[PDB]
């Protein structure tokens, strides 16, 4: 409703860097808000793409940002009669970034790994990896839960069980309030998908450079399965956290699996031991239900509600014809121990191929009416196909079915405006929560500042 689309702020990265692919707000130890931005195709030392991360100080005029430096060199360790190898070329560092406390977590889902032993090898595969930083102190750490030292032949002899070689850990990420990092790894267990969790504190205290394979004892990975419903499910394509079981001492995980059950798609709510509490099934095959998930109480009853995006959903139209427009589903959490029911509301895209629901950002309470609000991206939506972000306001019964405001992309065609989103933080400290929108195709980020309401809705 009250985001200001007249006076925007633009941050920019190098051309071809895909600056804006992921982003998040970051508060330093003093409460000063900055913007962390991933650029997964930024050039590295060997003039080859390795990705990078930028930490942009807040400034109404925007501009260029300083880099947040991480080690980009490939590593080798000869130990235990084996050879450990990391490969950072095209690893996509910055394909996901998240901030918690004064720590920044930036991931490289396509970092490759291999182990040699004489003439045998583990196989060169994308285990992924995460880089952690405490910008103010300079502390650095890494976390790569899927690295192993098992040789190829052993997997074959064991029928490829517990095969974490293609995890792509860091594909998605989130941090609990208590400071537990949760990584989505959609390629885990031979493309079933897995989750890896470990406390940030323990990741830092157990990491040392040069080791490559080390133990994080407090970590916890999810499980392999023999059920074909999970095969190629990409469980962990997206992740989030929230409170869904009524017990405030426990934190629940929300995990998207867009191709679960022969591309029907699904979203699961789990306890911190990876036991399944709820499962929401997709409505239409290949719609990519679970592509994106968001947790936020939208109807002001104090109970977290779930939003699920299915960007490729095909809407039924006249003459038995289907039209790919994308769709978002809202599930309101019921009182006490009960199962989430049918969706409470369905939001559907209008523009063909717009991919409405590709990203969903909680905005907090944008218009300050007592109800939390959301933004939904359609990266190729709008009448011109350039991209659109739509704002929906919360209400006692859920969300309004019509957008209160529409943000058209200020960038040229192909920018993917809206592919990444983040709200619910007041960056200029004017008392209203603001919205940052990534457009990796144009290597830029746009900041929309919320202002006082003109006429209320």
């Amino acid at each position, epitope marked *: 409703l009250n985001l200001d689309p007249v006076q925007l702020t633009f941050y920019a990265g190098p051309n071809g860097s895909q600056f804006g692919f992921s982003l998040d707000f970051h508060k330093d130890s003093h409460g000063r808000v900055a913007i962390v931005v991933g650029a997964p195709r930024t050039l590295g030392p060997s003039q080859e793409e390795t990705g990078g991360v930028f930490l942009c100080p807040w400034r109404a005029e925007g501009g260029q940002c300083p880099s947040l430096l991480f080690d980009l060199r490939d590593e080798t*360790r*000869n*130990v*235990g*009669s084996q050879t450990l190898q990391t490969f950072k070329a095209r690893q996509g560092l910055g394909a996901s970034v998240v901030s918690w406390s004064d720590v920044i977590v930036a991931c490289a889902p396509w970092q490759h790994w291999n182990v040699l032993e004489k003439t045998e090898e583990a196989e060169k595969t994308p285990v992924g990896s995460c880089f952690l930083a405490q910008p103010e102190s300079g502390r650095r750490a890494e976390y790569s839960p899927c690295r192993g*030292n098992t040789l190829s032949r*052993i997997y074959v002899e*064991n029928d490829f069980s517990w095969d974490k070689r293609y995890c792509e850990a860091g594909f998605s990420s989130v941090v609990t309030q208590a400071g537990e990092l949760v990584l989505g790894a959609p390629g885990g267990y031979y493309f079933l998908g897995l989750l890896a969790q470990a406390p940030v504190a323990d990741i830092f205290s*157990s*990491y*040392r450079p*040069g*080791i490559l*394979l*080390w*133990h994080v*004892s407090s970590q916890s990975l999810s499980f392999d399965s023999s059920n074909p419903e999970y095969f190629d499910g990409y469980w962990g394509y997206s992740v989030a956290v929230g409170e869904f079981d009524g017990d405030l001492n426990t934190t629940e995980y929300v995990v998207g699996a867009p191709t679960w059950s022969w591309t029907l798609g699904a979203v699961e709510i789990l306890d911190s031991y990876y036991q399944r509490l709820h499962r929401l099934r997709g409505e239409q095959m290949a719609s990519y239900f679970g592509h994106s998930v968001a947790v936020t109480d939208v109807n002001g009853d104090g109970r977290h509600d779930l939003l699920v995006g299915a960007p490729l959903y095909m809407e039924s139209r006249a003459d038995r014809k289907l039209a790919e427009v994308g769709r978002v589903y809202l599930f309101l959490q019921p009182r006490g121990p009960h199962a989430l029911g049918a969706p409470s509301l369905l939001l559907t895209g209008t523009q063909l191929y717009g991919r409405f629901g590709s990203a969903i950002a909680p905005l907090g309470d944008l218009d300050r009416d007592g109800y939390n609000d959301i933004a939904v991206a359609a990266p190729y939506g709008g009448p011109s196909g350039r991209g659109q972000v739509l704002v929906f306001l919360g209400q006692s019964e859920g969300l309004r079915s019509r957008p209160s405001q529409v943000l058209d992309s200020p960038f040229p065609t192909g920018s993917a405006f809206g592919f990444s989103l983040r709200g619910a933080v007041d960056i200029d400290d004017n008392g209203y929560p603001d919205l940052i929108v990534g457009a990796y195709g144009a290597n830029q980020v746009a900041v929309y500042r919320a202002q006082p309401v003109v006429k209320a809705s």
Partner: antibody
Amino acid sequence: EVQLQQSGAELVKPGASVKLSCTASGFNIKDTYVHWVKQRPEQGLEWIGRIDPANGYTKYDPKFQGKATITADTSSNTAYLQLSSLTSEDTAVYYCVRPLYDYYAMDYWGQGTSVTVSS
Amino acid sequence: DILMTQSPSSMSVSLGDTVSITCHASQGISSNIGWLQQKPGKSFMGLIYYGTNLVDGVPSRFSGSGSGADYSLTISSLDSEDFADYYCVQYAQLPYTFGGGTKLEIKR
């Protein structure tokens, strides 16, 4: 806190067999490699082998091949070292060891199990 | 098998002293070395891993250094508890091999 409780002092006759145990305390035996080390006053410290309790795969110093057999039971959070056809030279103190962080290191040690072979 | 030649086999020193135990391997082991402490009539405690990294709980007066095939454990300002046996171990290759050991004794 990580603690490795090994079995009590063993006293056996030559030609017999003995099976030492190492029970994990404060952690899951499955977490890391588990090594076995032999200590004698004169010969010093010798690495016998290791096992990955998760899958049971083992490695040995060829010197102990046939003599030593390493196993593990994740159910009882215990690792074992079985010695066969014992002799005077097998009289020594035996330790179970695991790393702290580094996969390949040797940082945590059990209290040790004394083994005496005599007629 | 890699050979670990540890020296000296023993040394007589006093409290407050800064001593150094060296270890030489028959080939390069790229910092894949650990240092161990055995107090009289007791078990082993890890001190260092991967050449220079202190094990959790170990005082900073202990430090490790070196590269290639030559490494050193150093104890600044010896304490009464530091009089014990010290062993180096390499894990660059299987089988793991240990040093001959070093006993720190009180000088009188």
